[PDB]
Structures are given as structure tokens and as C-alpha cells.
Enzyme design. Structure first.
Site, PDB file in Angstrom:
ATOM      1  N   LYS A   5     -33.790  31.072  35.750  1.00  0.00           N
ATOM      2  CA  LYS A   5     -34.801  31.990  35.314  1.00  0.00           C
ATOM      3  C   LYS A   5     -35.032  33.202  36.128  1.00  0.00           C
ATOM      4  N   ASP A  61     -44.433  34.334  28.840  1.00  0.00           N
ATOM      5  CA  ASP A  61     -45.347  33.732  28.243  1.00  0.00           C
ATOM      6  C   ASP A  61     -46.766  33.921  28.328  1.00  0.00           C
ATOM      7  OD1 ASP A  61     -43.319  31.821  27.545  1.00  0.00           O
ATOM      8  OD2 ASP A  61     -43.212  30.924  29.614  1.00  0.00           O
ATOM      9  N   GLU A  94     -46.673  33.895  24.548  1.00  0.00           N
ATOM     10  CA  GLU A  94     -46.125  32.730  23.765  1.00  0.00           C
ATOM     11  C   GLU A  94     -46.906  32.240  22.592  1.00  0.00           C
ATOM     12  OE1 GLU A  94     -42.447  29.721  24.150  1.00  0.00           O
ATOM     13  OE2 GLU A  94     -42.940  31.873  23.335  1.00  0.00           O
TER      14      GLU A  94
HETATM   15  C1  LIG Z   1     -59.607  21.725  20.449  1.00  0.00           C
HETATM   16  C2  LIG Z   1     -59.110  22.472  21.383  1.00  0.00           C
HETATM   17  C3  LIG Z   1     -58.444  23.644  20.835  1.00  0.00           C
HETATM   18  C4  LIG Z   1     -57.921  24.874  21.752  1.00  0.00           C
HETATM   19  C5  LIG Z   1     -56.817  25.872  21.224  1.00  0.00           C
HETATM   20  C6  LIG Z   1     -56.443  26.601  22.090  1.00  0.00           C
HETATM   21  C7  LIG Z   1     -54.956  27.147  21.433  1.00  0.00           C
HETATM   22  C8  LIG Z   1     -55.154  28.685  21.198  1.00  0.00           C
HETATM   23  C9  LIG Z   1     -55.354  28.744  19.676  1.00  0.00           C
HETATM   24  C10 LIG Z   1     -54.578  29.719  18.946  1.00  0.00           C
HETATM   25  C11 LIG Z   1     -55.418  30.686  18.209  1.00  0.00           C
HETATM   26  C12 LIG Z   1     -54.869  31.178  16.660  1.00  0.00           C
HETATM   27  N1  LIG Z   1     -54.675  32.455  16.591  1.00  0.00           N
HETATM   28  C13 LIG Z   1     -53.677  33.267  15.509  1.00  0.00           C
HETATM   29  C14 LIG Z   1     -53.502  34.502  15.861  1.00  0.00           C
HETATM   30  C15 LIG Z   1     -54.785  34.759  16.638  1.00  0.00           C
HETATM   31  C16 LIG Z   1     -55.253  33.650  17.219  1.00  0.00           C
HETATM   32  O1  LIG Z   1     -55.820  33.453  17.961  1.00  0.00           O
HETATM   33  N2  LIG Z   1     -53.620  30.588  19.745  1.00  0.00           N
HETATM   34  C17 LIG Z   1     -52.158  30.621  19.940  1.00  0.00           C
HETATM   35  C18 LIG Z   1     -51.627  31.851  20.321  1.00  0.00           C
HETATM   36  C19 LIG Z   1     -52.833  32.390  21.246  1.00  0.00           C
HETATM   37  C20 LIG Z   1     -53.967  31.765  20.741  1.00  0.00           C
HETATM   38  O2  LIG Z   1     -55.086  32.047  20.841  1.00  0.00           O
HETATM   39  N3  LIG Z   1     -56.291  29.236  21.796  1.00  0.00           N
HETATM   40  C21 LIG Z   1     -57.396  29.875  20.932  1.00  0.00           C
HETATM   41  C22 LIG Z   1     -58.620  30.109  22.150  1.00  0.00           C
HETATM   42  C23 LIG Z   1     -57.702  30.519  23.377  1.00  0.00           C
HETATM   43  C24 LIG Z   1     -56.347  29.796  23.198  1.00  0.00           C
HETATM   44  O3  LIG Z   1     -55.885  29.735  24.013  1.00  0.00           O
HETATM   45  N4  LIG Z   1     -55.727  25.917  23.432  1.00  0.00           N
HETATM   46  C25 LIG Z   1     -56.126  26.042  24.644  1.00  0.00           C
HETATM   47  C26 LIG Z   1     -56.092  24.472  25.483  1.00  0.00           C
HETATM   48  C27 LIG Z   1     -54.897  23.957  24.384  1.00  0.00           C
HETATM   49  C28 LIG Z   1     -55.006  24.419  23.281  1.00  0.00           C
HETATM   50  O4  LIG Z   1     -54.411  24.032  22.438  1.00  0.00           O
HETATM   51  N5  LIG Z   1     -59.284  25.639  22.489  1.00  0.00           N
HETATM   52  C29 LIG Z   1     -59.855  26.751  21.730  1.00  0.00           C
HETATM   53  C30 LIG Z   1     -60.840  27.265  23.016  1.00  0.00           C
HETATM   54  C31 LIG Z   1     -60.749  26.082  23.926  1.00  0.00           C
HETATM   55  C32 LIG Z   1     -59.644  25.613  23.809  1.00  0.00           C
HETATM   56  O5  LIG Z   1     -59.286  24.527  24.343  1.00  0.00           O
HETATM   57  N6  LIG Z   1     -57.878  21.864  22.118  1.00  0.00           N
HETATM   58  C33 LIG Z   1     -56.696  21.525  21.595  1.00  0.00           C
HETATM   59  C34 LIG Z   1     -55.987  20.275  22.389  1.00  0.00           C
HETATM   60  C35 LIG Z   1     -56.474  20.800  23.390  1.00  0.00           C
HETATM   61  C36 LIG Z   1     -57.775  21.633  23.500  1.00  0.00           C
HETATM   62  O6  LIG Z   1     -58.617  21.528  24.049  1.00  0.00           O
HETATM   63  C1  LIG Z   2     -33.205  30.314  21.053  1.00  0.00           C
HETATM   64  O1  LIG Z   2     -34.291  29.952  22.140  1.00  0.00           O
HETATM   65  C2  LIG Z   2     -35.689  30.036  21.686  1.00  0.00           C
HETATM   66  C3  LIG Z   2     -36.162  31.153  22.033  1.00  0.00           C
HETATM   67  C4  LIG Z   2     -37.480  31.383  21.590  1.00  0.00           C
HETATM   68  C5  LIG Z   2     -38.491  32.588  21.972  1.00  0.00           C
HETATM   69  C6  LIG Z   2     -38.431  33.049  23.400  1.00  0.00           C
HETATM   70  N1  LIG Z   2     -38.336  31.851  24.282  1.00  0.00           N
HETATM   71  C7  LIG Z   2     -39.265  31.398  25.521  1.00  0.00           C
HETATM   72  O2  LIG Z   2     -40.335  31.708  25.315  1.00  0.00           O
HETATM   73  C8  LIG Z   2     -38.988  30.084  26.200  1.00  0.00           C
HETATM   74  N2  LIG Z   2     -38.041  29.056  25.716  1.00  0.00           N
HETATM   75  C9  LIG Z   2     -37.779  27.755  26.676  1.00  0.00           C
HETATM   76  C10 LIG Z   2     -36.829  26.892  25.931  1.00  0.00           C
HETATM   77  C11 LIG Z   2     -35.606  27.462  25.529  1.00  0.00           C
HETATM   78  C12 LIG Z   2     -34.728  26.512  25.059  1.00  0.00           C
HETATM   79  C13 LIG Z   2     -35.116  25.070  24.850  1.00  0.00           C
HETATM   80  C14 LIG Z   2     -36.383  24.547  25.379  1.00  0.00           C
HETATM   81  C15 LIG Z   2     -37.402  25.643  25.879  1.00  0.00           C
HETATM   82  C16 LIG Z   2     -38.689  24.950  26.295  1.00  0.00           C
HETATM   83  F1  LIG Z   2     -39.489  25.656  25.442  1.00  0.00           F
HETATM   84  F2  LIG Z   2     -38.571  23.703  26.322  1.00  0.00           F
HETATM   85  F3  LIG Z   2     -38.847  25.424  27.542  1.00  0.00           F
HETATM   86  N3  LIG Z   2     -38.602  27.814  27.743  1.00  0.00           N
HETATM   87  C17 LIG Z   2     -39.342  28.712  28.346  1.00  0.00           C
HETATM   88  O3  LIG Z   2     -39.974  28.509  29.319  1.00  0.00           O
HETATM   89  C18 LIG Z   2     -39.647  30.113  27.542  1.00  0.00           C
HETATM   90  O4  LIG Z   2     -40.320  30.813  27.978  1.00  0.00           O
HETATM   91  C19 LIG Z   2     -38.249  30.300  21.438  1.00  0.00           C
HETATM   92  C20 LIG Z   2     -37.497  29.116  20.864  1.00  0.00           C
HETATM   93  C21 LIG Z   2     -36.144  28.919  21.181  1.00  0.00           C
HETATM   94  O5  LIG Z   2     -35.503  27.682  20.784  1.00  0.00           O
HETATM   95 MN   LIG Z   3     -41.292  29.723  29.236  1.00  0.00          MN
HETATM   96 MN   LIG Z   4     -41.841  31.954  26.383  1.00  0.00          MN
END
Ligand SMILES: C[C@H](C[C@@H](C[C@H](C[C@@H](C[C@@H](CCN1CCCC1=O)N1CCCC1=O)N1CCCC1=O)N1CCCC1=O)N1CCCC1=O)N1CCCC1=O
Ligand SMILES: COc1cc(CCNC(=O)c2nc(-c3ccccc3C(F)(F)F)[nH]c(=O)c2O)ccc1O
Ligand SMILES: [Mn+2]
Ligand SMILES: [Mn+2]
Length: 179
Positions: free
Chosen positions: A118, A92, A64
Site C-alpha cells: 500500500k 477510504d 468508501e
Molecule cells: C444499525 C446501525 C446502522 C449504522 C449505519 C452506518 C453505515 C452508514 C450508512 C450509509 C448511509 C447511506 N447513504 C446513501 C448516500 C447518503 C448516505 O448517507 N453510508 C454508506 C456511505 C457513508 C454512509 O453514511 N452510516 C450512516 C450514518 C453514519 C454512517 O457511517 N454504520 C456505522 C457503523 C457500522 C454501520 O453500518 N449506523 C447509523 C448511525 C450510527 C450507526 O452505527 N448499524 C449497522 C450494524 C452496525 C451498526 O451500528
Molecule cells: C478492482 O478492485 C476493486 C476496487 C474497488 C474500488 C477502490 N478499492 C478500494 O477502495 C479498496 N479495495 C481493497 C480490496 C481489493 C481487492 C480485494 C479485496 C479488497 C478488500 F476490500 F478486501 F480489502 N482493499 C482496500 O483496502 C481498499 O481501500 C472496489 C472493489 C474492487 O474489487
Molecule cells: Mn482500504
Molecule cells: Mn477503499
């Protein structure tokens, strides 16, 4: 300009808000009209991120939050690497520890109804299912809650805090009767 949108921007992380906006606009819905869906998508995103943060530093592959094409690419790689069946619907996360896709759910109903929906949608239940609720309840497939209870408790606490904030802004009632 809704109160719900301003609260969503004031409460959630900016990256989470930006990702929810992009995801909703990818499927043709506006964060400024469907504000309850906006908060719901932000909450789901934050819950999946906290979930992936639980456990090891590289146990979960996040599905996700990516673009639909890139997320499908990552699942294709994960399956053609580990031999797991290609899921019919985008999950997800993927657990490398347990070798299985996880579909995370956050619901304002009972874990039973959302889980049944689900699972009905999952058909061949190869993908694990894990449901959280805004009342502290949770339910996972075969009672395999994957992570230890501390991270799940942290997720439940965050959910209840979101709920309390929505209610103090008098936005919880409309948010509940919308799922
Ligand atoms: C301060 C700290 C920051 C969080 C950030 C992390 C979310 C997530 C970040 C992005 C990376 C973006 N893109 C763009 C394309 C390639 C790419 O990678 N995405 C989204 C898709 C998957 C992904 O990687 N990342 C990055 C590292 C692992 C991860 O899950 N997380 C995890 C907790 C909640 C949250 O926001 N980090 C950084 C590392 C440790 C950490 O917690 N925060 C914000 C509030 C809570 C918190 O602790
Ligand atoms: C049109 O539908 C949507 C579909 C997507 C892409 C794939 N969908 C998910 O990956 C996903 N979507 C939901 C969901 C759906 C409707 C309302 C609220 C939610 C929730 F986030 F709050 F839970 N729930 C899950 O658990 C989950 O895995 C993205 C956005 C869309 O609005
Ligand atoms: Mn989900
Ligand atoms: Mn999803």
C-alpha cells in the site's frame, strides 16, 4: 450458489452486502463467482464503517461505499477546502481532526507485506495508512493509530469472529489462500 455467498449474506449487514455487490459490479466482478472477494469487500466495508463510528460523531468523512464519481467529488471538495493534496488513488476515509486521508486495509497476510504494498502504491505518503489483520494485529503510519484502543479492539474482535465463523463453515482455508 456457493456456501461462501450464503454465509456472506447471513453474517454481514444487508446494506454492507448491497454496497459490496454494487462496488464489485461497478468494476466488473460478480459477487456470485468471486465469493472470497465478496467476503473481503464486505469485511473492508464493515471495518471502515466501524472506524468512522469511532471517535466523535462527525470526525471522519466516509469515502468508501460511495460511487466512484461521488467519492472523487467528496475528496475534491475535501482537498479544495483544507488544502490537502489530491490523492492519486481513492482513499477510504478523511480525518478532519488530523486533516488527512486514511486508507484502511484488512489483510490475511502480515501487516508488513500489505502495508509495504500500500505504501509503495501511495508514493507521496500524505495519506495515512492503517492495516488490520484477522489475527488481531494492526499497523498504522508513524504508529499513529488515530483512534483509541477500545474501538480498534472492537474491530479486531469482529475480524476474528468473522474468521472463526468462516472456519466453522470450513471456508477459512480457501479464503486465506486467495489474497
Ligand atoms: C444499525 C446501525 C446502522 C449504522 C449505519 C452506518 C453505515 C452508514 C450508512 C450509509 C448511509 C447511506 N447513504 C446513501 C448516500 C447518503 C448516505 O448517507 N453510508 C454508506 C456511505 C457513508 C454512509 O453514511 N452510516 C450512516 C450514518 C453514519 C454512517 O457511517 N454504520 C456505522 C457503523 C457500522 C454501520 O453500518 N449506523 C447509523 C448511525 C450510527 C450507526 O452505527 N448499524 C449497522 C450494524 C452496525 C451498526 O451500528
Ligand atoms: C478492482 O478492485 C476493486 C476496487 C474497488 C474500488 C477502490 N478499492 C478500494 O477502495 C479498496 N479495495 C481493497 C480490496 C481489493 C481487492 C480485494 C479485496 C479488497 C478488500 F476490500 F478486501 F480489502 N482493499 C482496500 O483496502 C481498499 O481501500 C472496489 C472493489 C474492487 O474489487
Ligand atoms: Mn482500504
Ligand atoms: Mn477503499
Amino acid at each position: 450458489g456457493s456456501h461462501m455467498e450464503d454465509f456472506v449474506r447471513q453474517c454481514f449487514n444487508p446494506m454492507i452486502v448491497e454496497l459490496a455487490e454494487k462496488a464489485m459490479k461497478e468494476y466488473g466482478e460478480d459477487p456470485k463467482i468471486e465469493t472470497n472477494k465478496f467476503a473481503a469487500t464486505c469485511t473492508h466495508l464493515e471495518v471502515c464503517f466501524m472506524y468512522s463510528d469511532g471517535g466523535s460523531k462527525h470526525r471522519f468523512e466516509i469515502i468508501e461505499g460511495r460511487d466512484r464519481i461521488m467519492a472523487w467529488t467528496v475528496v475534491n471538495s475535501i482537498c479544495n477546502t483544507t488544502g490537502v493534496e489530491k490523492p492519486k488513488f481513492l482513499p477510504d476515509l478523511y480525518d478532519y481532526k488530523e486533516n488527512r486521508f486514511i486508507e484502511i486495509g484488512v489483510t490475511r497476510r502480515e501487516v508488513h507485506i500489505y502495508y509495504l504494498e500500500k505504501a509503495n502504491k501511495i508514493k507521496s505518503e500524505k495519506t495515512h495508512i492503517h492495516i488490520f489483520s484477522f489475527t488481531g494485529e494492526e499497523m498504522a503510519t508513524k504508529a499513529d493509530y488515530t483512534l483509541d484502543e477500545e474501538s480498534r479492539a472492537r474491530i479486531k474482535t469482529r475480524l476474528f469472529t468473522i474468521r472463526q465463523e468462516m472456519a466453522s463453515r470450513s471456508l477459512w482455508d480457501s479464503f486465506r489462500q486467495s489474497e
